[PDB]
Each structure stands twice: as structure tokens, then as C-alpha cells.
């Protein structure tokens, strides 16, 4: 049966609650389609600061794992390493144990027990098996949920709720037919290791910007990024003003009230429109007073990425086994009508 899992909006990502071990140790971790391995901080993890203000053990603030209290833990005597786009990293030991999520249990789930990391907390990677940072192929949560007979396929639906929403939902092996308008549209996954889809164009406030490229739909990314000229064209339409941060690096700003829409044209005639306001974020001076303008939550990068500020505007069904991603404009509702992903 489809495993409905509650997502918690923590302002820069969406987390889920899982249990680990025979004692079902409660940990909270980031749901990330942009990686493939699940890792949780060890009870004695060494959290290293990456941001400014990172307190003592900020990374074990959502629980931690102690193999010792788990009658069913199993050290695999294999080192684990993984790096992420934002530069943070995680180092640990591979283990196997009973992992619980949304009322279901995954037996002998391989995952990593980290002793050093600069991430905010544990990360539940659910991408392609070929995306694992492990030097070999194993069963990650999705494939494991399928192999054990819980869900039909290594696949799940992502329902990042609305920007102001407190919770969202991700469904392993299911689809909540009542949370998306119109009809879902299939998009073939264009990469063998990353959850990428083809992007034809982007229309900003009436401005057509050809893309003819691939873009990463990643729940594990806070904002969105695009290639140099593409991002600059979007910034041009928006009318962004260039500023510099405390490091002398370029940053774009714009009037929070800036009107308009950003229409992402995907293949198979799928178009998702996202109001420019969803890409603007208001910061404040220490005096609580508003900054003159909002920050443009779109920066340039070597890769094209669409994260949370985009996905909240859509219902995303990732079908890893059938190598395809289906999308449709979202419909915000408590109501639900879940069916299995076939």
C-alpha cells in the first residue's frame, strides 16, 4: 500500500520523521530527491559550522543514532563519504537496520551513520540507485520499499505544499489524484544518475527565453538556479538590481510587489506557471524594518536547477523504475484520493 509520509516545512527544506533500530530511535531528516543515500548523525557526531551562527551540535538537533541501543544494528565496516552542491558534506560508517517511516518498516535498510558533517541534519536521499555515493549498488529506501512488497514501484509523489504551509506530503508508491489540477503529464527522465527533465523554454513576464536543456527538479534544493545567460535574461525581465553581499559577491534584488509570471515549458506540452512573487524573499534589518527590496531567489550556476520555490507550484510524481517524472499544476487541499503508482 502507498506510504503517505508527512513533510515538515522548515523554511529552506522539507523534513520527514523516521525511526531507526529495534528501539525505533526517532530522527528527523531532510527528504532529498537530489541524492540517493540515507544518512543520520551518530549520537556523538561532530557538527562543523558552515553557516554563521551554527551553535554547538546543531546537526543533531533532530535526533541522533546510537547503534548500541539497537538490538538489530549491524556495522558493515565500510566508510561512507558524500558531498553536496552547497559545499556541505557528511562522513560516516555504513550500517544496516530497521528503518521506519509513515507507519511502515523497512528491514535491513542500508544507510550511513555519520561522525562528521556540515549539513543541517540527516538527509534521506531517494534518487536513482546509480546516484548513491557508495562505491557500489545497494537498495535505497525506494527500491527497498518495492522489493519488500510495500509499494509497487520505486517511485513517489512530491507535494510540497504552499509557501505559507506548515506541512506537505510525499507518497511512496502512490499518487494523491486530488492534489493536482488537470491531468498529470509524463516527462521522461533525461539522466541516468540525476532526476532531470527536459526544459524547452522559460517565459518571464512575457519574455521568451529559450532553454533547450535539462533541469534538475530537486526537493533537496531551497531555491532555483540556471545557466548564466538564462539567469541574466530572467533577471532582465524581472528588472532586478545588482547588489553585493558581505563577501563582495553579486546578488540580485527586486521590488517585492513585482508582478508577472515565470512559465516553464517542459516537453510533452507541460507548462507550469509560477508567479514571480514565489521567487522573491523579503529580508529585514536588525531593526525589524524591511529592506528596500526583496531578494531574487534565482542565482546562476553551471547546472540548471528547480527546487522548492518551484516545486511548491506543482505536484511531482517521480517514477524511478519507469524512468519518468510526471507533473501537473498543484491544487492545495486537505482532501485526498490516493492510488498506487502502476
Amino acid at each position: 500500500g502507498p506510504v503517505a509520509v508527512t513533510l515538515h516545512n522548515e523554511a529552506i527544506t522539507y523534513t520527514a520523521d523516521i525511526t531507526v533500530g529495534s528501539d525505533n530511535q526517532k530522527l528527523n531528516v531532510i527528504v532529498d530527491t537530489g541524492s540517493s543515500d540515507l544518512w543520520i548523525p551518530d549520537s556523538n557526531v561532530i557538527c562543523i559550522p558552515k553557516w554563521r551562527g551554527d551553535k554547538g551540535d546543531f546537526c543533531k538537533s533532530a535526533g541522533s543514532y546510537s547503534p548500541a541501543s539497537s538490538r538489530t544494528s549491524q556495522n558493515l565496516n565500510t566508510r561512507f563519504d558524500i558531498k553536496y552542491g552547497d559545499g556541505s558534506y557528511a562522513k560516516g560508517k555504513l550500517y544496516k537496520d530497521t528503518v521506519g517511516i509513515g507507519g511502515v518498516s523497512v528491514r535491513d535498510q542500508l544507510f550511513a551513520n555519520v561522525w562528521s558533517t556540515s549539513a543541517r541534519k540527516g538527509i534521506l536521499g531517494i534518487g536513482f540507485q546509480s546516484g548513491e555515493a557508495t562505491e557500489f549498488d545497494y537498495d535505497n529506501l525506494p527500491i527497498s520499499l518495492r522489493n519488500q512488497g510495500i509499494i509497487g514501484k520505486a517511485a513517489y509523489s512530491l507535494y510540497l505544499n504552499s509557501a505559507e504551509a506548515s506541512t506537505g506530503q510525499i507518497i511512496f508508491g502512490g499518487i494523491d489524484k486530488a492534489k493536482y489540477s488537470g491531468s498529470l503529464v509524463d516527462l521522461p527522465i533525461t539522466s541516468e544518475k540525476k532526476l532531470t527533465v527536459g526544459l524547452r523554454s522559460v517565459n518571464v513576464r512575457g519574455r521568451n527565453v529559450d532553454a533547450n536543456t535539462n533541469v534538475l527538479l530537486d526537493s533537496g534544493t531551497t531555491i532555483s538556479y540556471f545557466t548564466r545567460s538564462i539567469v541574466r535574461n530572467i533577471l532582465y525581465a524581472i528588472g532586478a538590481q545588482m547588489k553585493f553581499d558581505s563577501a563582495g559577491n553579486k546578488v540580485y534584488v527586486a521590488d517585492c510587489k513585482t508582478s508577472g509570471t515565470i512559465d516553464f515549458q517542459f516537453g510533452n506540452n507541460l507548462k507550469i506557471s509560477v508567479p514571480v512573487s514565489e521567487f522573491l524573499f523579503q529580508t529585514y534589518y536588525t531593526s525589524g524594518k524591511p529592506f528596500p527590496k526583496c531578494e531574487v531567489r534565482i542565482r546562476e550556476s553551471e547546472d540548471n536547477i528547480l527546487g522548492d520555490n518551484f516545486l511548491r507550484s506543482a505536484y511531482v510524481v517521480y517514477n524511478l523504475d519507469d524512468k519518468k517524472i510526471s507533473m501537473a499544476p498543484v491544487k492545495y487541499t486537505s482532501e485526498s484520493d490516493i492510488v498506487a503508482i502502476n
Partner: peptide
């Protein structure tokens, strides 16, 4: 923010 794996 974050950007999740190389």
C-alpha cells in the same frame, strides 16, 4: 539555503 549531491 541548501543544494543537496555532486
Amino acid at each position: 539555503x541548501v543544494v543537496x549531491a555532486x
